[PDB]
Amino acid sequence: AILAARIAVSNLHKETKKVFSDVMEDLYNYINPHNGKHSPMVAKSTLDIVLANKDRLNSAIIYDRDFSYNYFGFKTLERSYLLKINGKVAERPQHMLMRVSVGIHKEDIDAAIETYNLLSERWFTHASPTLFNAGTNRPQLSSCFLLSMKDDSIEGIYDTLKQCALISKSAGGIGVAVSCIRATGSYIAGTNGNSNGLVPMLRVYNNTARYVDQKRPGAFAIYLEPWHLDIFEFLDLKKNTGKEEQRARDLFFALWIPDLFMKRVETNQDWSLMCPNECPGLDEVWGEEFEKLYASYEKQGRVRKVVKAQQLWYAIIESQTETGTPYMLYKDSCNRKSNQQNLGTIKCSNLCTEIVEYTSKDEVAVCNLASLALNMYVTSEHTYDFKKLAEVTKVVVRNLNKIIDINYYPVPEACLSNKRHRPIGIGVQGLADAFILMRYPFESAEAQLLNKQIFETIYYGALEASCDLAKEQGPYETYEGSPVSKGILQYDMWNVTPTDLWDWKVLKEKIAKYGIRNSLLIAPMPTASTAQILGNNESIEPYTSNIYTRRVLSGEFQIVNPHLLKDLTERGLWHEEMKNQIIACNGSIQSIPEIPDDLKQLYKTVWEISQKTVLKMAAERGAFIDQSQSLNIHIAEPNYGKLTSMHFYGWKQGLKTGMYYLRTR
Ligand SMILES: Cc1ccc(F)c([C@@H](C)[C@H](NS(=O)(=O)c2ccc(Cl)c3c2OCCN3C)c2n[nH]c(=O)o2)c1C
Ligand SMILES: Cc1cn([C@H]2C[C@H](O)[C@@H](COP(=O)(O)OP(=O)(O)OP(=O)(O)O)O2)c(=O)[nH]c1=O
Ligand SMILES: [Mg+2]
């Protein structure tokens, strides 16, 4: 299990060259056998730099560090992350890592080697696209894009479609605000007919996601505000039951929900469905300005239908019960608590619901992501190295900022947006793993403090780097007029006062003289592929299991949690019988009578951990997060009241993203 990883790392080493620069030459020199077309697999510019510096570069690589990958982490590396020559891997992990670092840092060889070390030791990681394409010809290094529908017209709709198509091709995830498109049955002046509405146009988007699928199908998340008249239909179209023309199951679904709707639901008032043609401008305002405008149309009776707000609500909950979706975002908090509110109202988040960025017809938002491994900063004295964490966080910020400049953009609107506001999104993995390492259960008061200190540190480290860059490079163009320019920082907009761990007075004074380089910095994302690679538990998120199991070609694996295992082995209580005992407990200790009630607390599973405390923790770290978090909700046995109970708590806590996916048993 641990051994098979050693073998597979060694075989690979046996079947690839050892010299980094010589591997780079082979990739660059690659020739299409069918064709004779010289089809370089790294950019020439990267290779020149490598060859000009081959002694430092080749020498700096430490191939011991290939052996840090666990088995399935490695297999995944070999399947998608290591460049192949005619179906044979050419690249060692270390080789790809060096490629990524030279690819980001170019001629600054010091900066490159620091990054290689940091990466190769697994202090952090860049997201998959940037691992895939750094050091490569016309390299698309960004994970996600967000789009506001261009125009409420066929010219507009198919223009956006082409953008989504081009972004899909280049490996971008998409989030799209569709709320301006006019409702089913609304009048069309120039042809004197009526709109077929949202469903039939989303059907075209759905086929486009299927068609442009380079190996998972294209991923588009569609954003609807609940005042729009097609809402009930929009909740139907994910479901596995019903008419084909009424469905779009390859798409993803999210609600961009105003405060006003939530208040109507709890007070049990009436909700007014509208058409954006009839009642324009609702998505371009938020909070009180929205509510005044929403009320205005309502007093005029420009209202296509009215319903019990509690009727919509039930429609949403059954969707989540059946489908796991839609995602729950609160437009008012997102807008209220944004360093970008400077630029206008923000109409959607992205595919994974952690990114909150402005878009318009001239602007497709982007975000480059990397993630810090939180387990990494636990000392052997069970101390947490906040100083180090901020050390590494500052590197990441600079890297991500370098990415903005060298990225190749699939559409010009995205280039403009990204160099205008220079947002980035740093996230995390192994938040659970850190806790176990510090001997804190997830729900303990110590974990709840740690949680805040970690995210205070990262946000502190981040701003501090961004600040230095504004020193060297200057502020981003739209810095002036922003909350941060006005001395307001993210915790201030949540009305929180930081722990005394870091001196914000200093920083708020550094930022006042120089400004910052990046409009936004922090956004915990899902990390599904990158956490499996590095063997850390997903982003935030309690441990799912003490046991991970997998049927492979040569039978099965049953990998007990490494953190648990070292501890039972130590407190000499480990047995092979306990392995099969756990499986019956579906991942859980708690039942096994032979195990310490101290350990049992520490390795409690996700299905056995308070979702309220989860929400409370998101909210507490949320105050140190510029953007949002891809927060799943685990409720084994859902019902109407539970989900309702959960959503309102999330909302009242002031979460920008109340729920990402709903997971059940
Ligand atoms: C306020 C709140 C927030 C989020 C949330 F998910 C929920 C419930 C739907 C949610 N229901 S539940 O998951 O089935 C559940 C229901 C009841 C209990 Cl006692 C627990 C529980 O979760 C796991 C262990 N605990 C403490 C819950 N989390 N924490 C809690 O006290 O209840 C509530 C009541
Ligand atoms: C022409 C057409 C438009 N539509 C939808 C797309 C948009 O939501 C909306 C407007 O389409 P447009 O292309 O704007 O139609 P138009 O310019 O002729 O009308 P207007 O002067 O009212 O702008 O109607 C259909 O659903 N089916 C159709 O066949
Ligand atoms: Mg028109």
PDB file of C-alpha atoms and ligand atoms in Angstrom, residues 443 606-613 615 633-637 641-643 645-647 649, ligand 1:
ATOM      1  CA  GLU A 443     -15.349  20.654  17.176  1.00  0.00           C
ATOM      2  CA  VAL A 606     -18.006  14.002   8.687  1.00  0.00           C
ATOM      3  CA  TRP A 607     -21.366  12.144   9.150  1.00  0.00           C
ATOM      4  CA  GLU A 608     -20.788  12.461  12.943  1.00  0.00           C
ATOM      5  CA  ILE A 609     -19.845  16.160  13.223  1.00  0.00           C
ATOM      6  CA  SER A 610     -22.063  19.158  13.809  1.00  0.00           C
ATOM      7  CA  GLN A 611     -22.955  20.896  10.551  1.00  0.00           C
ATOM      8  CA  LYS A 612     -23.789  23.995  12.618  1.00  0.00           C
ATOM      9  CA  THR A 613     -20.270  24.006  14.016  1.00  0.00           C
ATOM     10  CA  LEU A 615     -21.098  26.633   9.435  1.00  0.00           C
ATOM     11  CA  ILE A 633     -22.839  20.176   3.793  1.00  0.00           C
ATOM     12  CA  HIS A 634     -23.081  16.612   5.027  1.00  0.00           C
ATOM     13  CA  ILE A 635     -26.476  15.514   6.342  1.00  0.00           C
ATOM     14  CA  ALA A 636     -26.908  11.760   6.419  1.00  0.00           C
ATOM     15  CA  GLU A 637     -30.697  11.676   6.759  1.00  0.00           C
ATOM     16  CA  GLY A 641     -36.824  21.055   8.432  1.00  0.00           C
ATOM     17  CA  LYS A 642     -33.177  20.117   8.663  1.00  0.00           C
ATOM     18  CA  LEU A 643     -32.223  21.773   5.376  1.00  0.00           C
ATOM     19  CA  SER A 645     -32.767  24.981   9.577  1.00  0.00           C
ATOM     20  CA  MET A 646     -29.253  24.750   8.060  1.00  0.00           C
ATOM     21  CA  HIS A 647     -29.731  27.369   5.269  1.00  0.00           C
ATOM     22  CA  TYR A 649     -28.240  29.632  10.005  1.00  0.00           C
TER      23      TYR A 649
HETATM   24  C1  LIG B   1     -28.727  25.158  13.311  1.00  0.00           C
HETATM   25  C2  LIG B   1     -28.287  24.073  12.373  1.00  0.00           C
HETATM   26  C3  LIG B   1     -27.254  24.343  11.463  1.00  0.00           C
HETATM   27  C4  LIG B   1     -26.827  23.383  10.553  1.00  0.00           C
HETATM   28  C5  LIG B   1     -27.388  22.106  10.502  1.00  0.00           C
HETATM   29  F1  LIG B   1     -26.941  21.213   9.612  1.00  0.00           F
HETATM   30  C6  LIG B   1     -28.496  21.701  11.415  1.00  0.00           C
HETATM   31  C7  LIG B   1     -29.087  20.319  11.339  1.00  0.00           C
HETATM   32  C8  LIG B   1     -29.861  20.165  10.032  1.00  0.00           C
HETATM   33  C9  LIG B   1     -28.048  19.202  11.496  1.00  0.00           C
HETATM   34  N1  LIG B   1     -28.767  17.940  11.574  1.00  0.00           N
HETATM   35  S1  LIG B   1     -27.984  16.556  11.683  1.00  0.00           S
HETATM   36  O1  LIG B   1     -26.761  16.649  10.956  1.00  0.00           O
HETATM   37  O2  LIG B   1     -28.741  15.453  11.180  1.00  0.00           O
HETATM   38  C10 LIG B   1     -27.791  16.410  13.256  1.00  0.00           C
HETATM   39  C11 LIG B   1     -28.924  16.397  14.066  1.00  0.00           C
HETATM   40  C12 LIG B   1     -28.843  16.289  15.453  1.00  0.00           C
HETATM   41  C13 LIG B   1     -27.626  16.202  16.128  1.00  0.00           C
HETATM   42 CL1  LIG B   1     -27.674  16.060  17.919  1.00  0.00          CL
HETATM   43  C14 LIG B   1     -26.362  16.225  15.343  1.00  0.00           C
HETATM   44  C15 LIG B   1     -26.455  16.336  13.877  1.00  0.00           C
HETATM   45  O3  LIG B   1     -25.283  16.333  13.172  1.00  0.00           O
HETATM   46  C16 LIG B   1     -24.261  15.419  13.587  1.00  0.00           C
HETATM   47  C17 LIG B   1     -24.123  15.260  15.121  1.00  0.00           C
HETATM   48  N2  LIG B   1     -25.061  16.139  15.837  1.00  0.00           N
HETATM   49  C18 LIG B   1     -24.618  16.936  16.973  1.00  0.00           C
HETATM   50  C19 LIG B   1     -27.161  19.614  12.634  1.00  0.00           C
HETATM   51  N3  LIG B   1     -25.826  19.945  12.692  1.00  0.00           N
HETATM   52  N4  LIG B   1     -25.600  20.345  14.020  1.00  0.00           N
HETATM   53  C20 LIG B   1     -26.769  20.277  14.642  1.00  0.00           C
HETATM   54  O4  LIG B   1     -26.899  20.590  15.876  1.00  0.00           O
HETATM   55  O5  LIG B   1     -27.797  19.835  13.845  1.00  0.00           O
HETATM   56  C21 LIG B   1     -28.963  22.732  12.396  1.00  0.00           C
HETATM   57  C22 LIG B   1     -30.079  22.409  13.376  1.00  0.00           C
END
